[PDB]
Amino acid sequence: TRERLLSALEDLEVLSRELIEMLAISRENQVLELLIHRDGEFQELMKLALNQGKIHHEMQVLEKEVEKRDSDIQQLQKQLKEAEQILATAVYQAKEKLKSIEKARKGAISSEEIIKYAHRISASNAVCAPLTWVPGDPRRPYPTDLEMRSGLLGQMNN
């Protein structure tokens, strides 16, 4: 609206100057009547300008309320986020232990079978080394060359 105001200003200015100047050089009713029209329309635009100034003051109060509600929203957000993160790590470690419990639920063996199998796995040192071992000792945690060459696999097919 500033453009229309300023155009009405400069138009009023130099055309009123022209009316004054033709009066002065005489000693033009049409451009007079148009000057009357420009003056009235300029005063109407000044009234609209004061009204829009009231509108802008209302807008300033309103955007201050906007920023205050934005700050309230964000102060909800950050605290809800930190609560979310703490509970997320908590339920994650709990679901780790629950996964391990559910794997243990799948396999359930009688105790004597566990003891018997532990005896077969560690009567001869198969899964855990002999206590006095130096490199070059023949025994190994794999089958070994002699057990392979003396088994049914090596002998009975050959």
């Binding site: 309230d72 102060q75 909800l76 605290q79 809800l80 930190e82 609560a83 703490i86 509970l87 908590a90």
Partner: peptide
Amino acid sequence: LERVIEMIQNCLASLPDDL
């Protein structure tokens, strides 16, 4: 769990005080 609950609670306790 308890801490998270009371955390949520006090933040909710903050929000009508903004309203």
